[PDB]
Amino acid sequence: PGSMSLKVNILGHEFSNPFMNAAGVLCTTEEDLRRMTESESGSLIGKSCTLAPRTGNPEPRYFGLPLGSINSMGLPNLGVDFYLSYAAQTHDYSRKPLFLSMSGLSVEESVEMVKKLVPITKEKGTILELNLSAPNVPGKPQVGYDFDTTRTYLQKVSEAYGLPFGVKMPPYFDIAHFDMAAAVLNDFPLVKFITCVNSIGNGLVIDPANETVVIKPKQGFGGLGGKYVLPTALANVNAFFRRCPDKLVFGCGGVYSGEEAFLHILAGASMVQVGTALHDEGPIIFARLNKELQEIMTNKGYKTLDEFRGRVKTM
Amino acid sequence: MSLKVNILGHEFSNPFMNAAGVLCTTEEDLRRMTESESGSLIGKSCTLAPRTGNPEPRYFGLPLGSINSMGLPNLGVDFYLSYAAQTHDYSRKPLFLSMSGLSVEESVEMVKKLVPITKEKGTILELNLSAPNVPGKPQVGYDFDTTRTYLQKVSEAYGLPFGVKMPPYFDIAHFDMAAAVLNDFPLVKFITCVNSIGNGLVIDPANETVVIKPKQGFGGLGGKYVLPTALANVNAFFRRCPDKLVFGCGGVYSGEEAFLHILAGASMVQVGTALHDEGPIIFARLNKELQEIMTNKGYKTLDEFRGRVKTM
Numbered sequence: 001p002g003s004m005s006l007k008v009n010i011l012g013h014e015f016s017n018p019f020m021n022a023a024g025v026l027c028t029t030e031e032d033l034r035r036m037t038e039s040e041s042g043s044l045i046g047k048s049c050t051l052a053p054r055t056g057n058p059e060p061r062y063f064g065l066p067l068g069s070i071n072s073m074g075l076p077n078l079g080v081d082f083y084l085s086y087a088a089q090t091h092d093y094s095r096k097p098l099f100l101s102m103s104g105l106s107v108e109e110s111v112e113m114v115k116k117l118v119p120i121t122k123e124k125g126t127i128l129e130l131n132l133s134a135p136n137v138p139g140k141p142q143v144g145y146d147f148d149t150t151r152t153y154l155q156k157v158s159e160a161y162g163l164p165f166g167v168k169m170p171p172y173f174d175i176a177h178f179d180m181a182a183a184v185l186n187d188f189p190l191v192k193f194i195t196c197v198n199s200i201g202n203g204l205v206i207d208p209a210n211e212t213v214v215i216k217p218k219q220g221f222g223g224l225g226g227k228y229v230l231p232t233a234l235a236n237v238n239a240f241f242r243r244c245p246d247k248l249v250f251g252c253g254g255v256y257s258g259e260e261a262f263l264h265i266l267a268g269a270s271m272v273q274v275g276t277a278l279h280d281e282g283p284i285i286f287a288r289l290n291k292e293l294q295e296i297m298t299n300k301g302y303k304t305l306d307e308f309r310g311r312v313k314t315m
Numbered sequence: 316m317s318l319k320v321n322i323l324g325h326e327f328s329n330p331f332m333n334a335a336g337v338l339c340t341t342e343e344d345l346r347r348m349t350e351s352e353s354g355s356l357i358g359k360s361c362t363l364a365p366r367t368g369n370p371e372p373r374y375f376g377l378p379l380g381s382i383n384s385m386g387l388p389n390l391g392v393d394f395y396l397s398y399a400a401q402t403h404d405y406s407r408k409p410l411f412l413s414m415s416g417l418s419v420e421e422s423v424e425m426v427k428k429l430v431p432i433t434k435e436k437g438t439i440l441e442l443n444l445s446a447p448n449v450p451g452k453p454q455v456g457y458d459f460d461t462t463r464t465y466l467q468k469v470s471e472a473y474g475l476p477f478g479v480k481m482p483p484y485f486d487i488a489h490f491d492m493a494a495a496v497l498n499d500f501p502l503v504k505f506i507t508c509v510n511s512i513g514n515g516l517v518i519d520p521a522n523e524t525v526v527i528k529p530k531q532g533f534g535g536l537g538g539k540y541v542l543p544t545a546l547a548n549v550n551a552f553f554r555r556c557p558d559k560l561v562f563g564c565g566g567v568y569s570g571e572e573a574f575l576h577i578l579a580g581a582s583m584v585q586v587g588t589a590l591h592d593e594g595p596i597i598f599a600r601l602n603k604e605l606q607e608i609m610t611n612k613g614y615k616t617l618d619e620f621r622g623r624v625k626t627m
């Protein structure tokens with residue numbers, strides 16, 4: 001205290017800064033995870049994994065846009081065994097804490113996956129982010145848009161895993177939905193953080209030149225990231241910050257600079273995840289974001305994030 | 316070369332109209348829309364009695380569009396019906412009225428009054444099931460049970476062709492469920508996709524304060540934020556609701572975005588944020604731009620490419 005710091009605390013762990021990759025970006029392979037570990041990021045998270053490996057959807061399945069991105073990756077991943085081995089043997093925990101995202105396509109699959117994480121969480125401190133918002137799996141709706149199904153996942157994972165974990169939520173657009181989602185989450189004491197938000201699901205981008213969609217899967221429909229999602233993300237962060245006071249909120253969506261990171265934290269974010277901008281710029285972005293956030297804080301006379309986290313002013 | 320749209324018996328000069336809520340609250344607003352180069356116009360979403368709406372500030376223009384929490388300010392259904400019955404010049408262009416009762420009971424009462432005027436003048440109803448800015452009223456369209464009730468009661472009470480203004484959906488199962496409901500009501504002849512993306516939050520980094528007063532800063536997003544969402548919704552319903560027309564609304568600033576909406580399946584193309592920014596002279600620009608694109612591609616009518624977007 002009394003000195004400028006970007007440090008963050010979560011259940012004992014101390015993080016150097018609030019920044020990490022958004023799940024799915026620069027975190028699928030050992031090489032990806034090494035580059036994230038080597039970066040100036042406060043933490044990193046592994047690709048949303050499934051019990052068995054997946055190669056994902058056919059190409060093209062990612063398209064960069066002026067205002068962000070559209071993707072239908074289809075959960076390409078090396079399978080849970082790979083991520084667990086990485087967490088257990090490979091990751092350098094002296095550099096930074098590690099999160100793993102898990103996206104079992106059924107409650108049954110999720111239970112089996114999280115049971116395997118338990119020993120490694122105990123041994124190494126690996127943190128779980130349960131993905132309830134994957135929008136690009138043909139035939140599987142975003143779990144988080146069904147509160148009955150969501151309650152089932154949270155119950156079974158709480159029983160099987162039995163340790164503090166977090167959830168990656170879809171964006172909500174209705175006050176009643178904020179209320180219902182919070183009511184479910186507030187029934188699970190083991191849920192200690194909420195990541196707001198996953199991509200804005202099932203957008204469509206068309207090229208006027210050739211009258212053709214720009215991605216191949218699902219007739220061109222894909223999740224939107226980047227500048228498109230910033231107001232949505234801030235609203236979700238703030239809505240859950242207020243409704244779930246005993247839980248932390250991680251902000252994800254539209255972060256390209258210190259300015260957006262500042263707004264996320266104002267809204268209530270503990271950690272700030274970076275997807276599209278990281279895909280564009282590479283891991284050097286974390287060095288830039290640390291600098292830019294420090295600049296804004298200096299200009300406003302803040303030394304720590306604790307001075308302005310959740311202090312957004314209403315009228 | 317032709318921008319004409321022949322639907323519901325009417326001949327629209329071009330596909331363009333205002334989005335409900337933009338330049339359509341007062342008599343002066345409606346006159347300016349009628350005098351514009353738009354193919355049509357729609358009245359502000361109305362209630363049985365007048366409303367003054369939410370406290371200020373409740374609108375903020377952004378680089379990438381707009382946030383609003385207007386709260387359904389309107390002069391009441393009698394004013395809009397009176398406009399439709401006596402004032403509007405039908406030889407200039409057809410007229411839609413948006414109605415947004417806060418209960419099914421209110422909606423029923425309003426549409427019953429429209430029946431005679433539709434019959435005599437041809438006024439077209441758009442039923443608003445997607446208002447996101449009324450404190451303590453969730454968007455009807457996100458509750459399929461409640462949506463069904465509104466469509467049942469309105470179908471019974473109105474008993475004429477009408478359309479529905481839908482909230483944006485983000486999930487295939489929701490496209491399926493919404494279409495399932497809509498396809499049970501033969502009188503629903505058009506679907507307008509989409510209303511604003513509900514309950515976004517804008518914060519000014521300079522003063523660390525939200526930009527609108529209602530609902531702790533939470534308001535509906537319009538403009539460049541919504542184009543991909545709007546296109547997806549237009550196309551989803553175009554394919555799932557073949558017995559219905561689809562109107563496109565969201566992120567139209569130019570002929571190019573209009574072209575995309577029509578390629579996705581749109582019959583009419585509504586303009587909100589860009590019209591709020593530029594005024595009714597935008598419609599002159601849009602007609603020229605769409606014309607130019609059609610010329611470049613060799614299309615003589617909108618029918619030649621409506622809903623003909625190509626997939627891989």
Ligand SMILES: Cc1cc2c(cc1C)N(C[C@H](O)[C@H](O)[C@H](O)COP(=O)(O)O)c1[nH]c(=O)[nH]c(=O)c1N2
Pocket residue numbers: 022023024025047048062069071073075101131168197198199224225226227229252253254255273274275276277279
């Ligand atoms: C290429 C790619 C791949 C993925 C994603 C995104 C992109 C662009 N996203 C969503 C991501 O974590 C994030 O929530 C959104 O992209 C919004 O953040 P940005 O606006 O992109 O920073 C994602 N989310 C998740 O929980 N698990 C995943 O495996 C993926 N995969």
Ligand SMILES: Cc1cc2c(cc1C)N(C[C@H](O)[C@H](O)[C@H](O)COP(=O)(O)O)c1[nH]c(=O)[nH]c(=O)c1N2
Pocket residue numbers: 334335336337359360374381383385387413443480509510511536537538539541564565566567585586587588589591
């Ligand atoms: C100031 C203002 C007022 C309203 C709106 C918007 C704005 C900006 N919108 C939503 C509008 O009709 C449209 O669906 C969205 O704004 C998306 O279109 P744009 O991206 O803005 O072109 C709206 N929609 C509706 O059905 N009834 C209404 O009364 C209003 N009112």
Ligand SMILES: O=C1C[C@@H](C(=O)O)NC(=O)N1
Pocket residue numbers: 024048071072073074075076131133134135136137198199223
């Ligand atoms: O959670 C997810 C899954 C990912 C993918 O498709 O792999 N894409 C996304 O946008 N979010």
Ligand SMILES: O=C1C[C@@H](C(=O)O)NC(=O)N1
Pocket residue numbers: 336360383384385386387388443445446447448449510511535
């Ligand atoms: O349907 C509506 C209602 C309007 C308002 O708040 O008056 N604003 C909107 O964005 N959509």
